[PDB]
Write a protein that holds these residues in place. Structure first.
Motif, PDB file in Angstrom:
ATOM      1  N   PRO A 171       0.781  -1.246   0.000  1.00  9.03           N
ATOM      2  CA  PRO A 171       0.000   0.000   0.000  1.00  9.03           C
ATOM      3  C   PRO A 171       0.824   1.314   0.000  1.00  9.03           C
ATOM      4  CG  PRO A 171      -0.277  -1.240   2.063  1.00  9.03           C
ATOM      5  CD  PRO A 171       0.379  -2.150   1.093  1.00  9.03           C
ATOM      6  N   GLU A 172       1.986   1.319   0.651  1.00 13.51           N
ATOM      7  CA  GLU A 172       2.826   2.523   0.704  1.00 13.51           C
ATOM      8  C   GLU A 172       3.437   2.928  -0.675  1.00 13.51           C
ATOM      9  OE1 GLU A 172       5.341  -0.838   2.747  1.00 13.51           O
ATOM     10  OE2 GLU A 172       3.226  -0.308   2.454  1.00 13.51           O
ATOM     11  N   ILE A 173       3.658   1.943  -1.542  1.00 14.86           N
ATOM     12  CA  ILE A 173       4.023   2.231  -2.923  1.00 14.86           C
ATOM     13  C   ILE A 173       2.829   2.802  -3.717  1.00 14.86           C
ATOM     14  CG2 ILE A 173       5.019   1.344  -5.088  1.00 14.86           C
ATOM     15  CD1 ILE A 173       6.458  -0.750  -3.347  1.00 14.86           C
ATOM     16  N   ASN A 176       2.876   6.345  -3.017  1.00 12.53           N
ATOM     17  CA  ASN A 176       4.073   7.157  -3.338  1.00 12.53           C
ATOM     18  C   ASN A 176       4.796   7.638  -2.076  1.00 12.53           C
ATOM     19  OD1 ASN A 176       5.631   8.114  -5.612  1.00 12.53           O
ATOM     20  ND2 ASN A 176       5.042  10.227  -5.074  1.00 12.53           N
ATOM     21  N   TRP A 177       4.805   6.793  -1.050  1.00 14.31           N
ATOM     22  CA  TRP A 177       5.439   7.094   0.233  1.00 14.31           C
ATOM     23  C   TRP A 177       6.903   7.513   0.151  1.00 14.31           C
ATOM     24  CZ3 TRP A 177       1.740   5.940   4.246  1.00 14.31           C
ATOM     25  CH2 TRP A 177       2.115   6.374   5.526  1.00 14.31           C
ATOM     26  N   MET A 178       7.666   6.897  -0.743  1.00 14.91           N
ATOM     27  CA  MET A 178       9.085   7.259  -0.952  1.00 14.91           C
ATOM     28  C   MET A 178      10.176   6.783   0.035  1.00 14.91           C
ATOM     29  SD  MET A 178       9.503   7.749  -3.815  1.00 14.91           S
ATOM     30  CE  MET A 178      10.936   7.869  -4.896  1.00 14.91           C
ATOM     31  N   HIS A 179       9.835   6.349   1.242  1.00 19.00           N
ATOM     32  CA  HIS A 179      10.875   5.825   2.145  1.00 19.00           C
ATOM     33  C   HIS A 179      10.659   4.320   2.331  1.00 19.00           C
ATOM     34  N   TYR A 180      10.695   3.581   1.227  1.00 14.21           N
ATOM     35  CA  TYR A 180      10.291   2.182   1.238  1.00 14.21           C
ATOM     36  C   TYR A 180      11.296   1.329   1.976  1.00 14.21           C
ATOM     37  CZ  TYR A 180       7.329   4.022  -2.405  1.00 14.21           C
ATOM     38  OH  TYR A 180       6.420   4.770  -3.077  1.00 14.21           O
ATOM     39  N   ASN A 181      10.788   0.401   2.763  1.00 13.88           N
ATOM     40  CA  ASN A 181      11.686  -0.589   3.290  1.00 13.88           C
ATOM     41  C   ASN A 181      11.476  -1.955   2.632  1.00 13.88           C
ATOM     42  OD1 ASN A 181       9.364  -1.415   4.879  1.00 13.88           O
ATOM     43  ND2 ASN A 181      10.910  -2.601   5.991  1.00 13.88           N
ATOM     44  N   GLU A 225      -1.485   3.701  16.519  1.00 12.92           N
ATOM     45  CA  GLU A 225      -0.023   3.638  16.456  1.00 12.92           C
ATOM     46  C   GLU A 225       0.516   3.910  15.037  1.00 12.92           C
ATOM     47  OE1 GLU A 225       2.421   3.288  19.235  1.00 12.92           O
ATOM     48  OE2 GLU A 225       0.481   4.057  19.946  1.00 12.92           O
ATOM     49  N   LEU A 226      -0.212   3.467  14.005  1.00  9.91           N
ATOM     50  CA  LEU A 226       0.258   3.717  12.646  1.00  9.91           C
ATOM     51  C   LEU A 226       0.091   5.194  12.331  1.00  9.91           C
ATOM     52  CD1 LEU A 226       1.351   3.131   9.824  1.00  9.91           C
ATOM     53  CD2 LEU A 226      -0.812   2.085   9.230  1.00  9.91           C
ATOM     54  N   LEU A 227      -1.028   5.752  12.778  1.00 12.54           N
ATOM     55  CA  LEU A 227      -1.383   7.118  12.455  1.00 12.54           C
ATOM     56  C   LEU A 227      -0.324   8.105  12.970  1.00 12.54           C
ATOM     57  CD1 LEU A 227      -5.270   6.913  13.279  1.00 12.54           C
ATOM     58  CD2 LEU A 227      -4.379   7.585  11.044  1.00 12.54           C
ATOM     59  N   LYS A 228       0.312   7.769  14.093  1.00  8.86           N
ATOM     60  CA  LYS A 228       1.403   8.561  14.658  1.00  8.86           C
ATOM     61  C   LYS A 228       2.615   8.725  13.741  1.00  8.86           C
ATOM     62  CE  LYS A 228       0.659   8.061  19.548  1.00  8.86           C
ATOM     63  NZ  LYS A 228       1.189   7.494  20.812  1.00  8.86           N
ATOM     64  N   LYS A 229       2.734   7.852  12.746  1.00 10.22           N
ATOM     65  CA  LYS A 229       3.911   7.797  11.902  1.00 10.22           C
ATOM     66  C   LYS A 229       3.683   8.418  10.534  1.00 10.22           C
ATOM     67  CE  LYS A 229       6.007   3.565  12.437  1.00 10.22           C
ATOM     68  NZ  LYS A 229       5.792   2.076  12.465  1.00 10.22           N
ATOM     69  N   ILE A 230       2.525   9.057  10.344  1.00 11.85           N
ATOM     70  CA  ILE A 230       2.167   9.678   9.059  1.00 11.85           C
ATOM     71  C   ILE A 230       2.419  11.179   9.069  1.00 11.85           C
ATOM     72  CG2 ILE A 230       0.365  10.041   7.302  1.00 11.85           C
ATOM     73  CD1 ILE A 230      -1.039   7.527   8.507  1.00 11.85           C
ATOM     74  N   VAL A 270       0.583  -7.000   7.289  1.00  6.40           N
ATOM     75  CA  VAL A 270       0.350  -5.967   8.264  1.00  6.40           C
ATOM     76  C   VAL A 270       0.490  -4.660   7.518  1.00  6.40           C
ATOM     77  CG1 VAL A 270       1.151  -5.024  10.448  1.00  6.40           C
ATOM     78  CG2 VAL A 270       1.219  -7.446  10.104  1.00  6.40           C
ATOM     79  N   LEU A 271      -0.467  -3.762   7.725  1.00  5.54           N
ATOM     80  CA  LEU A 271      -0.438  -2.471   7.059  1.00  5.54           C
ATOM     81  C   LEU A 271       0.853  -1.712   7.347  1.00  5.54           C
ATOM     82  CD1 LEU A 271      -2.498  -1.161   5.105  1.00  5.54           C
ATOM     83  CD2 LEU A 271      -3.235   0.270   7.067  1.00  5.54           C
ATOM     84  N   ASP A 272       1.242  -1.708   8.618  1.00  6.09           N
ATOM     85  CA  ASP A 272       2.481  -1.047   9.077  1.00  6.09           C
ATOM     86  C   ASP A 272       3.705  -1.832   8.607  1.00  6.09           C
ATOM     87  OD1 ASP A 272       4.496   0.397  10.414  1.00  6.09           O
ATOM     88  OD2 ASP A 272       3.422   0.443  12.321  1.00  6.09           O
ATOM     89  N   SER A 273       4.411  -1.288   7.611  1.00  4.14           N
ATOM     90  CA  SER A 273       5.561  -1.961   7.047  1.00  4.14           C
ATOM     91  C   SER A 273       6.631  -2.250   8.111  1.00  4.14           C
ATOM     92  CB  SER A 273       6.147  -1.155   5.884  1.00  4.14           C
ATOM     93  OG  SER A 273       6.918  -0.072   6.373  1.00  4.14           O
ATOM     94  N   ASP A 274       6.633  -1.480   9.209  1.00  2.00           N
ATOM     95  CA  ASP A 274       7.568  -1.707  10.330  1.00  2.00           C
ATOM     96  C   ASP A 274       7.222  -2.951  11.120  1.00  2.00           C
ATOM     97  OD1 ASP A 274       7.701   1.848  10.814  1.00  2.00           O
ATOM     98  OD2 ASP A 274       9.286   0.577   9.969  1.00  2.00           O
ATOM     99  N   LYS A 275       6.004  -3.445  10.984  1.00  2.00           N
ATOM    100  CA  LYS A 275       5.627  -4.616  11.762  1.00  2.00           C
ATOM    101  C   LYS A 275       5.457  -5.885  10.924  1.00  2.00           C
ATOM    102  CE  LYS A 275       3.773  -1.966  15.665  1.00  2.00           C
ATOM    103  NZ  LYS A 275       5.199  -1.551  15.899  1.00  2.00           N
TER     104      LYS A 275
HETATM  105  C1  LIG Z   1      -4.821   4.664   3.433  1.00  2.00           C
HETATM  106  C2  LIG Z   1      -3.833   3.495   3.348  1.00  2.00           C
HETATM  107  C3  LIG Z   1      -2.846   3.541   4.524  1.00  2.00           C
HETATM  108  C4  LIG Z   1      -1.527   2.841   4.172  1.00  2.00           C
HETATM  109  C5  LIG Z   1      -0.545   2.887   5.342  1.00  2.00           C
HETATM  110  C6  LIG Z   1       0.890   2.635   4.886  1.00  2.00           C
HETATM  111  C7  LIG Z   1       1.647   1.819   5.918  1.00  2.00           C
HETATM  112  C8  LIG Z   1       3.108   1.645   5.525  1.00  2.00           C
HETATM  113  O1  LIG Z   1       3.906   1.416   6.733  1.00  2.00           O
HETATM  114  C9  LIG Z   1       4.776   2.566   6.882  1.00  2.00           C
HETATM  115  O2  LIG Z   1       5.741   2.463   5.806  1.00  2.00           O
HETATM  116  C10 LIG Z   1       6.506   3.669   5.649  1.00  2.00           C
HETATM  117  C11 LIG Z   1       7.117   3.618   4.215  1.00  2.00           C
HETATM  118  O3  LIG Z   1       8.233   2.748   4.226  1.00  2.00           O
HETATM  119  C12 LIG Z   1       7.422   3.730   6.900  1.00  2.00           C
HETATM  120  O4  LIG Z   1       8.317   4.834   6.837  1.00  2.00           O
HETATM  121  C13 LIG Z   1       6.547   3.826   8.160  1.00  2.00           C
HETATM  122  O5  LIG Z   1       7.393   3.802   9.284  1.00  2.00           O
HETATM  123  C14 LIG Z   1       5.581   2.624   8.187  1.00  2.00           C
HETATM  124  O6  LIG Z   1       4.721   2.650   9.339  1.00  2.00           O
END
Ligand SMILES: CCCCCCCCO[C@@H]1O[C@H](CO)[C@@H](O)[C@H](O)[C@H]1O
Ligand SMILES: Cc1nc(Nc2ncc(C(=O)Nc3c(C)cccc3Cl)s2)cc(N2CCN(CCO)CC2)n1
Length: 333
Positions: A171-173, A176-181, A225-230, A270-275
């Motif tokens: 989902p983060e791609i 266009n999140w840009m800090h992909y792990n 917890e995820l929302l804190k990281k946006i 898991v939605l949170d790529s960190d988890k």
């Molecule tokens: C509306 C859809 C919500 C999608 C939530 C995206 C969750 C991705 O997870 C996130 O990935 C980022 C990108 O690498 C990391 O920097 C964040 O720490 C991480 O929590």
């Protein structure tokens, strides 16, 4: 020293290749690929002639990148370079690059055929994917586009990672999140694994926004917890305006599946790529009990990606590419 080359017209260009490679037969058209028979090794191979490899700065860097990457990958579950050659006898004549790999006979679209695989067979296929991913990730490389068509298999079900098309994307791609792990590839694996167990695409989105819709129905809306990281103001505000959906219980989604398979799916998607579970951690998971071997899940040598920041001239990328051709050492037969 130099092999003897022969000329032959193939997909409307003149290919020029060592004698060892016989019976070239086009199979695809960046670059065209022929299947061939390597008389030195008794192997069926894919020979790729790169298209316009040094036509521009961008072409040349892309050529160099592809060569560097293929040269680095030395692992049973990742496509490797059997050979690289050029008809050129010096840098001054260097205009053509040919890459050689094993000829893979099928991909994971062809194996699934949209019918369910057995759980034992999913274990073996996913294990190999994760084994390859561990290796790739250990080199600090992210694939970013894992999907059934990028996963090639032989008749013994031995799999190699190679390099709709949005179905397997984290989902983060999509955002266009840009800090992909590296766990973006883990997301992709979960999507693939789901499909192999069920025979159906997990998230067959019709368009871009539809892809995200289907994803959120399975895994819930972002938790506190995820929302804190946006950091994005626009994303936070839109997310806060959605009707909160509960993460579904995967056990009541994948009916009759091995509960170990289900547990692994929960850890991948898991939605949170960190988890998300890592590839190394996924290999230690009890679902892979009968395949897992800590003695034989190797890591890669460090991979020097510094060229990626560099802005060099066509002739400089060309000379660096030529250095890589010249230094090439064939793998042990
Ligand atoms: C509306 C859809 C919500 C999608 C939530 C995206 C969750 C991705 O997870 C996130 O990935 C980022 C990108 O690498 C990391 O920097 C964040 O720490 C991480 O929590
Ligand atoms: C396009 C194609 N590829 C096949 N196998 C391949 N193996 C390796 C390939 C390859 O690209 N390697 C590579 C890579 C990955 C990077 C850099 C450099 C290189 Cl060299 S492509 C088989 C095939 N088939 C068509 C359908 N069938 C006939 C039906 O009757 C037969 C099978 N089609």
């Amino acid at each position: 020293e130099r092999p003897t080359f022969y000329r032959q017209e193939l997909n409307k260009t003149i290919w020029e290749v060592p004698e060892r490679y016989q019976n070239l037969s086009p199979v695809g058209s960046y670059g065209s690929v022929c299947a061939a028979f390597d008389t030195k090794t008794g192997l069926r191979v894919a020979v790729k002639k790169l298209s316009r490899p040094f036509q521009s700065i961008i072409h040349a860097k892309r050529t160099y990148r592809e060569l560097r990457l293929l040269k680095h990958m030395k692992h049973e579950n990742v496509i490797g370079l059997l050979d690289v050659f050029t008809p050129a006898r010096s840098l001054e004549e260097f205009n053509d690059v040919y890459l050689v790999t094993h000829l893979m006979g099928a991909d994971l679209n062809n194996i699934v055929k949209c019918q369910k695989l057995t759980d034992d067979h999913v274990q073996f296929l996913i294990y190999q994917i994760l084994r390859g991913l561990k290796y790739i990730h250990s080199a600090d490389i992210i694939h970013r586009d894992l999907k059934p068509s990028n996963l090639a298999v032989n008749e013994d079900c031995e799999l190699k990672i190679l390099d709709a098309t949005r179905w397997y994307r984290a989902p983060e791609i999509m955002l266009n999140w840009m800090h992909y792990n590296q766990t973006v590839d883990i997301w992709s694996v979960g999507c693939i694994m789901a499909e192999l167990l069920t025979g159906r695409t997990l998230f067959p989105g019709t368009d871009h926004i539809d892809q995200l819709k289907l994803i959120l129905r399975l895994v819930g809306t972002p938790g506190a917890e995820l929302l804190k990281k946006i950091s994005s103001e626009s994303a936070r505000n839109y997310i806060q305006s959605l009707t909160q959906m509960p993460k579904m219980n995967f056990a009541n989604v994948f009916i009759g599946a091995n509960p170990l398979a289900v547990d692994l799916l929960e850890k991948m998607l898991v939605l949170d790529s960190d988890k998300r579970i890592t590839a190394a951690q996924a290999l230690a998971h009890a679902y892979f009990a009968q395949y897992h071997d800590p003695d034989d899940e190797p890591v890669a040598d460090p991979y020097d990606q510094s060229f990626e920041s560099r802005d060099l001239l066509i002739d400089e990328w060309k000379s660096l590419t030529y250095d890589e051709v010249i230094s090439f050492v064939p793998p042990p037969l």
